[PDB]
Amino acid sequence: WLSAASFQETTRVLTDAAINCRSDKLNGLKENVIIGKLIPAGTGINRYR
Amino acid sequence: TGGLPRVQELFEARVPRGKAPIADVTGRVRLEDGERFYKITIVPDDGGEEVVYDKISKRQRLRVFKHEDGSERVLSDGDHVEVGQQLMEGSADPHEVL
Amino acid sequence: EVIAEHPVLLNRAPTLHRLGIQAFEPMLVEGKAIQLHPLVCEAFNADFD
Amino acid sequence: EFIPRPVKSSFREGLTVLEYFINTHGARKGLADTALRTADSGYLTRRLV
């Protein structure tokens, strides 16, 4: 829901997420950039760190 | 600038502006030209329900395709088509193609 | 001797593709304008006006 | 559309007054489209990304 909310139509996305009680696993590029940890691409994957 | 709208229409998967009907089955073409509306039935050679493509406004040409003779011909009466070939002129429909 | 072997990143907007940001080795010059190599003006799409 | 009357003189000889007037219709259109189609291009690029 974080990526979708930051793309477009924040109000509708947030209303649907609240009604459904969704949870976010935080395994993308946008979410990692937003919260402030390494993206899972390039020099940020486990085999390279 | 004139090309960008087409790309945006393709990527967004919308119904094309100048839609062109696509033949479903290979059959016997009968172009019953009307006053200002064309009509195609494509009688199924396999056997089934006649597919009546009607309400074709006189705004478009007919596809000059490689007919059974191996040369470029305009779709006329008594012609035989292939499964999934557009008849009129314009853009096809991605959903119908799928 | 404190700036030797320490690269810097140069950027010009809009950043339409990847090569809009690039890393160079700095050298001190007299004046107030940045000097740019002739061959990297097509990636940035920059001209001097 | 095309104006039936052509421009029969080059910029080396020099255009006349109304030849120079009817030639300004074509530059304004380019200058205005350049500033109005970039938004469409950028929006499409953001959606693609």
Add this chain to the structure above:
Amino acid sequence: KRLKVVAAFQQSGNSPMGMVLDAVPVIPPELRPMVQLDGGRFATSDLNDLYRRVINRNNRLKRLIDLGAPEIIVNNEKRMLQESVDALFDNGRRGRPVTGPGNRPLKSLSDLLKGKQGRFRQNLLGKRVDYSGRSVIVVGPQLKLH
């Protein structure tokens, strides 16, 4: 269409009685500050006046209820209180947007998140940074490619 929502409210452990409010949270003060003008008057903060209207209306309604006024007056007060809270949460959705000096609509809580100027697209995906500079560029035909 109805099942899309009824199933969502059934499957999970949540209850539908969250659409009706009995208390209203207040954002911490550091996030809605007041700025002094040339050592003179203040500049207002939008968020500090919607809360003010809500609390004033609530106090008036409470005083009217405690006094035993006719039910019609208290109903009118309740209607106005609900409209005030609606204006606080999302302004302009229903009716005339609440305006201030110069008949300019005020900024509600929902406008801190939506749009090209909201927090999502203006403060989280891009930022301002230290150790940065800017200047005009000229040509040096003597540098190496690096």
Add this chain to the structure above:
Amino acid sequence: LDVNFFDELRIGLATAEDIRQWSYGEVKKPETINYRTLKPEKDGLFCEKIFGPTRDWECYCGKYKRVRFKGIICERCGVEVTRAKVRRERMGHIELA
């Protein structure tokens, strides 16, 4: 705090009990700031007893102005003696009629 300990981020609806759990006090007056002493009003939208002290290790009246007296609460004003940044992390609530 380290980002490596985050595993999920959940969202949902909030009931009245949650809202009263978050809050540190109820605001019951529209007043925000005083014009004479330039200090937050009592029980207003900027009250210090609810949201926190304005100045580090200071009370509201006169009592505590030193670090070594931290933790305890003034018996006259009730404002906690602590750092001034807590004013950007605390919430109150309004009790509708």
Add this chain to the structure above:
Amino acid sequence: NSVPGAPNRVSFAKLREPLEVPGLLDVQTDSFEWLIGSPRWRESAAERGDVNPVGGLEEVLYELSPIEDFSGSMSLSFSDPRFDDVKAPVDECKDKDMTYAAPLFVTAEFINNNTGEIKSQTVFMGDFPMMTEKGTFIINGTERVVVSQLVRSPGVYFDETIDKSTDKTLHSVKVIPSRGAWLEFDVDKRDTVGVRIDRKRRQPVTVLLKALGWTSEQIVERFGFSEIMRSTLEKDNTVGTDEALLDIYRKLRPGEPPTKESAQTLLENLFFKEKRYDLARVGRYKVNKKLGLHVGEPITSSTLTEEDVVATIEYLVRLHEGQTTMTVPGGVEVPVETDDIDHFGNRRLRTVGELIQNQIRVGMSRMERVVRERMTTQDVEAITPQTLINIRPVVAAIKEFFGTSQLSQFMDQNNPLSGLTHKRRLSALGPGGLSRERAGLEVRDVHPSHYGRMCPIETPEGPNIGLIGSLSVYARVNPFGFIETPYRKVVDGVVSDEIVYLTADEEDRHVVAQANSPIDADGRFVEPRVLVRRKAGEVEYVPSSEVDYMDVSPRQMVSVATAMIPFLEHDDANRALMGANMQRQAVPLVRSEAPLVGTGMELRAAIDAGDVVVAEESGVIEEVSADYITVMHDNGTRRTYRMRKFARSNHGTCANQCPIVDAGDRVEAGQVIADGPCTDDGEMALGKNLLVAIMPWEGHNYEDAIILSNRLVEEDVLTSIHIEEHEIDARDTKLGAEEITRDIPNISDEVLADLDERGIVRIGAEVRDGDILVGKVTPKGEAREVRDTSLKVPHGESGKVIGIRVFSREDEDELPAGVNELVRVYVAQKRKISDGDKLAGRHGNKGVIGKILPVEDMPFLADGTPVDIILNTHGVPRRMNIGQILETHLGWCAHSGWKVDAAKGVPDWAARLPDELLEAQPNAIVSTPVFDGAQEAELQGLLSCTLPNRDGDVLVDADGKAMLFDGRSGEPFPYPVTVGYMYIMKLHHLVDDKIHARSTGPYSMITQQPLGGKAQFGGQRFGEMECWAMQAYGAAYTLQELLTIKSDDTVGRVKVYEAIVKGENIPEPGIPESFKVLLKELQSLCLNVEVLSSDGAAIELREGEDEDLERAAANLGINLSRN
């Protein structure tokens, strides 16, 4: 010519001008003369009709009164506006930050009908701002300009549209008043004509026709020729006057008892009564001219009538049917056709007078309600005019217009041309106009009706392209607001000398020839076939037999800034537009010499701008100095002119004036006496003449860069003075009073040296970044508790101190409340040319200086003179601006001089050359008008007869090319190069105002990210697309470091700084503040957001008892560091 002391600048022009250019600032002054009601306007208007010379304020006052109450026993009336003398001259107002205005009085009378007594007295109405002699206003010490607005005029507009499915024709009619409610008629999908009263729903027209008092048989008696009317009648089921009135009353007004009286009064008080509906003057004129109603009778009572509605219905029905001409009983014949909305016959202009008249109208309307209400609350026999009038609303409206508005704009004062062009500007935006984003593409285009009225070339190239324009040279403004142009009348094939001003409506009724036609010196065209402009703006080649008008001259379709470009018809439109825009950005230099080759427009564009001193009457100059000029008139009177020296401009440049007369010379009225910023002997001079070679050179002029010589720095060829102004205030506070003094807290006495005995710095002291200007000390707080808050010098600034201005409350000076002293310090500096500065030419050239070379390694001619500037040859051919090479050739010829050998006849190519143009002396000045100047045959002929240098040598051959040497190797170049002289100007984009760097400074408050901008130490934004680029590269640590410790991580910043200073390793980031603010906002919207761990147990994420040490001593950078 026609100017008493103008220099001699011979011209290449072949034609003759029947008319001279008008005053270029009258568009601004005529409106204000009309509004005020001054005698000069009264006489001018009386000349062309003395029917009713109604002023601008008196018309508002007469349309306001009389004011009566419900009963009708009391009345109040205003009249006789009158202005007193101005409070103070303009210089004092600009010095003290006060508005320049005059008091305004009226006469108000109150009469009660019951008894009969009348009480009349004068009433004060506030201070009215007054316009100066240049057309600018001085509000709060700032110079401002009010710009004209292009609007759509009120009237009746017909429109046609094509159906999407049925492919039919749908017609519409729209009635647009000045103030009131709109009504629109239309034909819908089927044959049913509908009317949408005030844009709500759609009722058949028959309902309205019946409701206005028409029987069910009269419609057939009058509209009995169309079938759509029959269809509309058939499905009506209303057949009733009162029924229709009730239906309309219920449809318009929702939720009220539809009483018949109310129904029959609302309509009569919506489109017919002069209280809520107006078709001001112009609207009635256009309505009467469209439908062909009564014409000739003076217009009065401008309100919509029933005849207009019936005529509109008839017109719409005929247009839909397909007829071409219609006539209504009692009217003249008129054609039936849809009309265009961009035609300059439909768009009108609001000038300054009307713009301020509207605001005065609003203010008086607001005051009227208060005056009318005060009558029913107090007692009679004590009501006097001074007890019903409060002037607060009027002053509020005036002060809210002149300041804080989108049409009164901060003046542009780069140079005289920019200021002269800021006025003479037509703007489509504004309140009641268009929008900058949702504008379109058909309103931003050039229309064939702009010929002679609005320049097609000059316009912005940003998001305002096509929405802002400039008036043409000869155009003026109609009383209604329509632009006019002069034409010369031709009868029976002979071109007369009578000039008539026509507007687009009339210009579409005749055939107008071209300006440059072959007149046979006797009034007849050389060749019958001529290009003419027909009705619809099309140009056609027709025999010279039916023409009836001609253009007054070429250059009649261009503005004033576009008429200063020589060889304009050789450039493409884009580069010409760029050059016209860039001519208004040049900075004044210290010498300001005039162009060698130019047009004839410079002399008039400087006298009418207003930056020079011109003698008012003839006399003998008695004394001249650098401060004043004393002229002794011929009738024993004497007059002294003062001069402004080193005065700062709105944009930080320098404004100077210098006398150019001797101690015994005799002057004449209108002659120039002193120079100005960018003027040289009366002519506008924006640049300098430089010797140019065109060639690529070692790659230092690659991609529009420029190579410059070192003689332009040694000899101050391109140098300018820039001034800056600083301010500080000593205001009161609760703990005490702030005072500027010398006893600062503990700071070295080495820095208290320049400050004089009582604070402020000394005049003449040189200051650098970080120095103290005025020393102020403020009470700190629990005496001796004080803090240092003195005024410093910002980063990267320097220069001398020119003047100091100190105001005080002790000597009774006008200052705001709570401030005892105000000090302003002026700092000036000289500025030489350097790498990064921007140069340009008149033909769209533009570039930055890439290198500055020593004199001894530049290409030099045979006699040893180095060139001054080198321009690359790869930018000329593909941009289509070859006026610059023509200018180069002609400039070389003008510099060197020529002499045509005509001992045995005159050469065939020099037949058309005017005499006195067959010979020139070195350093001559010539003129090339915009659309008739030097031909290439004449230039090629002049290039072949040029005088030699001091030796018998000719440096440039018949092609305009020279042989150069190489300054570094000495070997001559292998081929000849093009050399000449060009006019170069210095733009106001200097690299000293553009360099910026930061490592640590102030931060924000809600989010802790760095501030933005140069004014405060600000960081550079790392946008979204740069994040995309970083993610595409694969750099996962650079991005994380950029987004956490360099922007938002409040605890990582100090640790990073300490690690860097102490040489250890950079630590790991944390959690930024922006995410926390986002979570707080989401919770505040009544959403339960939580951060969970690997096994539930949501993380606290609320700080804690962590290390709170402050090492490194020095503040991270938010502020500076004290000794």
Add this chain to the structure above:
RNA sequence: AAGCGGAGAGGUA
């Protein structure tokens, strides 16, 4: 030991 928000206008690539 101490402040930095909104509205409008005009420009550069």
Add this chain to the structure above:
DNA sequence: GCGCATGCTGCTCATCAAAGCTGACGGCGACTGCCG
């Protein structure tokens, strides 16, 4: 000469205001009276 009364003037506080305004346009879906 002193007391009383009347008129400039500083300080202070409210949100329910509406007559003014009117030159954006394509895509997509709910929905609502309205005909049949």
Add this chain to the structure above:
DNA sequence: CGGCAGTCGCCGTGTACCTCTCCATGAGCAGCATGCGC
């Protein structure tokens, strides 16, 4: 009942930088300051 077609409302409409001006009122409610009368 059954469709049905229009109509209305909400969503979106490129990036980075520089310079300038202005920011709620009216009316009420004391608080004196001056003139007049005994």
